[model samples]
Target: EFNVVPYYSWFSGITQFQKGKEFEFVEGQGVPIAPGVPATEAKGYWYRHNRRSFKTADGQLLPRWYFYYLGTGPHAKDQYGTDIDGVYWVASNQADVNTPADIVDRDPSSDEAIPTRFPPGTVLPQGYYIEG
Candidate 1:
């Protein structure tokens, strides 16, 4: 299991904006191995984002971005259509996935939390793209 924290920054160093969330996938577990169906299906494999950097098989460094998907199961859907059982797709900005308008963030200093907005779309300032 690994933990992912939401961060924000101005001039200062990247600071945690909220508590980290735990995930089941380990580092480098779900990499695409072949072309076609196998590669397409492998896209669903969960991976851990090493901060903003993800090292591709070809020794290329890529930035990771958050994505949302409609989860199947019994759970109330939030305003953004995410449910309790929903999972986040932490992948490259160019990854094919649904981007959420905003993500809920909590103040790290607060014990009783009030949710705040963190726009997932703008998280990676470089923007989205598809690698050829």
Candidate 2:
């Protein structure tokens, strides 16, 4: 019963390079046209409705909480290094306190409610999938 809910996000990849002093371009001569910016700010838009399902304690199936745009995924890399993707909700970055990604939907007193809201936009990225 995991319905495909809407998901939207806009993110830019950033890294710590020039920290101590000012600097200028150092690499060139067929340096492979980077798909994204590197200097400081680099961002793009992504939209998709990924409906992922799960099995319950019983033999029933149900959808789970959906968290959208809680943080940012790493930028696409050209060199040889590991990158990560995905985000989870939090209360404080400086402190240790934080909350779970979203709210509950199976509450009996109330009704089926989604914790996260969908972002505005069109255009799902390439290879977007919605299973049957």
Candidate 3:
């Protein structure tokens, strides 16, 4: 009987990239895009939720507090070096109020709470199941 109540906070016009800095044209395009006077910011809306824990496919339980964020913007890269962006559930296992190291477990369409990480039958607070 585990339930995670997500508290919502709206963030607008958040700065994703600092101004006067060089940003990659793409992720690994080698080409750099110079920023203007204004810092590169996100115009769309985004949401941040409270911390929660989940089980890994390896049967390891992450009981530590993990903040959750939902929206489109810059995020931490996964183990595969993939960016965790767009409309996805990103979990940050940070303790205090520092820059979070967000991590995306699996595809939203997948029933697995954490896909290959969480073992089968493991269910997340959000009600996503891990199938065998």
Candidate 4:
């Protein structure tokens, strides 16, 4: 439900030397969840969706909204894999989960959003262990 304007993005790009990147909305292409597999509750469940990326510029502008899933309940036994539908292991709360770095609360606030990266078993109410 969050929308990030182009300005909200933190980016760095080459001028005159390289082209700016493009960003797009692919909500039209998102596939809805399958019927009756459990975990459809509104509050705790999130949907799996896809978006089309714009290639007009080449810095990093992330989507404002992101989703993450934890294997629990009936899915507790389900390990994350590409072969699995609506389930992907290693998803992130941040737009780009590709970069590798120690988990840090850059904003210094979890009241708004959690860090995209953190130590194992940091699914909340348990503990948040991140390296500085």
Best by lDDT: 1
lDDT of 2 by residue, 1-132 (tens): 224433322221112222332211221110111224231221121222223446567541112222222222222221111222222222212222122212222335454332222123322222222121
Compose the digit string of candidate 1's lDDT tens values, residues 7-121. 3211111122233423332322222222222222222222213345455676422333222221211111332223334333332333343432222322445433212222333
Winner on lDDT (3 vs 4): 4
CA lDDT scores, all candidates in order:
0.27, 0.23, 0.25, 0.26
- Of the two candidates 1 and 3, the one with more favorable lDDT, higher being better, is 1
lDDT of 3 by residue, 17-117 (tens): 22233212222121111122111221111222223447567632212222223222233322222343332232212222133223233344553232113
Collision count of model 2: 0
Q: Which ten residues in a row have the lowest lDDT in candidate 2?
A: 23-32
Clashing pairs in 3: 51-66, 56-117, 56-118, 57-117, 57-118, 57-119
Give candidate 2 misplaced runs (Cα > 4 Å): 1-106, 113-117, 129-132
Whose TM-score is higher: candidate 2's or candidate 3's?
2
Error of 4 at 90 (Å): 2.8
Q: Please give the RMSD to the true structure for each candidate, in Å.
A: 17.9, 17.3, 17.7, 16.2
Weakest lDDT window of 10 consecutive positions for candidate 3: 30-39
Model 2 TM-score on a 0 to 1 scale: 0.19
Q: Backbone clashes per model, in order? A: 0, 0, 6, 10
The residue ranges of model 1 lying beyond 4 angstroms of the native Cα positions read 1-21, 24-83, 99-132
Q: What are the per-residue Cα lDDT tens digits for candidate 4 across 17-113? A: 1123222113221111223312222111122223345677554332222322333322334443324554324433332223222222112243343
